[PDB]
Amino acid sequence: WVPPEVFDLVAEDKARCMSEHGTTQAQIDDVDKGNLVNEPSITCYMYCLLEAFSLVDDEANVDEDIMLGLLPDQLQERAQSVMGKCLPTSGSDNCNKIYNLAKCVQESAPDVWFVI
């Protein structure tokens, strides 16, 4: 997890989402080291990618079933647990909703919130 196959299937959406939002790979790496700031270039990137895979709707409500279904078996209990705490999402906008969600997951259970 993330399994290598996923990276090829996400490549085009990753590229578009970074281009749309001004995202750098260094920002993604930061999020993945647990450093998250409320900067739209990274927060809107995370929303963009979740939306590309139908994990969120037009108001950044999470499809928890689809999200669960994407994760490895050994993470799913921990993920369900973190989502019971961290959903529903709230924020000033779709990007900020996902930032708050990312914080909440990082604060509660580190290894769940990985961002491709």
For Cl ion, the closer CB: 18 or 62? 62
Would you say how long the chain is, in residues?
116
Residue 59 beta carbon to Cl ion: minimum distance, rounded to whole angstroms: 9
Gap between the Cα atoms of 114 and 91, Å rounded = 20
For Cl ion, the closer CB: 18 or 95? 95
Contact 67, 17 (CB under 8 A): no
Residue nearest to Cl ion (CB): 88
For Cl ion, the closer CB: 30 or 76? 76
Residue 101 beta carbon to Cl ion: minimum distance, rounded to whole angstroms: 8
Burial 21-47 (b: 16+ CB within 10 A, else e): bebeeebbebbeeeebeebeebbbbbb
Q: Is 11 exposed, middle or buried (0-12, 13-18, 19+ CB in 10 A)?
A: exposed
Q: How is residue 8 written in tokens?
A: 């090829």
Residue 11 beta carbon to Cl ion: minimum distance, rounded to whole angstroms: 27
Residue 66 beta carbon to Cl ion: minimum distance, rounded to whole angstroms: 12
For Cl ion, the closer CB: 18 or 55? 55
What residue ranges bind Cl ion (CB under 5 A)?
61-62, 87-89
